[PDB]
Structure 1
Amino acid sequence: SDLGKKLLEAARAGRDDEVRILMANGADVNAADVVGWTPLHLAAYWGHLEIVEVLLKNGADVNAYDTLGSTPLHLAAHFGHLEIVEVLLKNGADVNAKDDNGITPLHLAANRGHLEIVEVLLKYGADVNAQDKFGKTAFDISINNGNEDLAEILQ
């Protein structure tokens, strides 16, 4: 897609006004690059909140997953983008989505010590006992990393 590509580039770049015009012209919100990232993936990774919102209004798949099973929520949680985490969840993001390694948004937020994001994930039903492929929980991560504050949150 000509306009799908342009949209991928614009979502990544955070070019807000360019995303708008592209939405007006029917640029494919479910365009995917070679690694399976949608515009929503891109905007989530790079922390572009307004663009996330616009894409969701225009019927972006909130639980699109990449070629390794990661979702926009995974990326927003991992890279500390609280508002985007909230927006995604409000729009039905699977709070317990596992990637191909059995890693969840909670695992990722925990690993980077993003306290507020962990609480939001928990508030929306994040499974605190979910294990990755190595049998590890967000709690295990917090302990290994020596994050006392995050350990206390995860009882």
Structure 2
Amino acid sequence: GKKLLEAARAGRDDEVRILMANGADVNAADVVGWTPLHLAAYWGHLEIVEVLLKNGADVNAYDTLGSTPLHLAAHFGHLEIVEVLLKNGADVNAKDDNGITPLHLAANRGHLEIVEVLLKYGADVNAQDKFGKTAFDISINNGNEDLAEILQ
């Protein structure tokens, strides 16, 4: 499991398969609750995200602050990983302990394509975080007009 977490982060595709063929826990979690999926999502390892999912990795694993791999992918602008995660049933409206959704994160960093995909799978535009802010609110505050109209 520990070897897998590491290999997942290092984007070592073959290594991930090997430990998989030797049956390491797909849902192994480090000290902050990140799974190999969290790791591959954050660092942008598309092929490892796909191998992990087809080996039954929990697509909706959450860390110790309630954040899923979909949060990480959306936030860091990994459009393909977002789609792969969504196509594998990732909860598009997943909230972390802050009430923050993947749409909030994508909106906030202005990842327009990602925003569109999220909406495409039925992201709730009206979803508010702990401060009552929506993605729309965020687009306005950031003065992102392109993003702002897409959210209306």
- Distance (whole Å) between structure 2 residues aligned to residue 54 and residue 128 of structure 1: 31
* Structure 2 partner of 1:16: 13
- Distance (whole Å) between structure 1 residues aligned to residue 27 and residue 137 of structure 2: 36
Q: Secondary structure at the match of 2:72?
A: helix
User: What are the Cα deviations for residues 51-87 of structure 1, in whole angstroms up to 9, with x where unaligned?
Assistant: 0000000000000000000000000000000000000
How far 1:139 moved relative to its partner?
A: 0.2
- Distance (whole Å) between structure 1 residues aligned to residue 28 and residue 18 of structure 2: 16
**Which of 120, 123, 126 does residue 123 from structure 2 map onto?**
126
Q: Secondary structure at the match of 2:106?
A: helix
How far 1:109 moved relative to its partner?
A: 0.1
How far 1:96 moved relative to its partner?
A: 0.1
**Any unmatched runs of 5+ in structure 2?**
none
TM-score of the superposed pair, with normalisation by structure 2: 1.00
**Any unmatched runs of 5+ in structure 1?**
none
Q: Secondary structure at the match of 1:88?
A: helix
Identity percentage over the alignment? 100
**Does structure 1 residue 112 correspond to structure 2 residue 109?**
yes
Q: Number of aligned pairs?
A: 152
Shift >6 Å, 4+ stretches: none
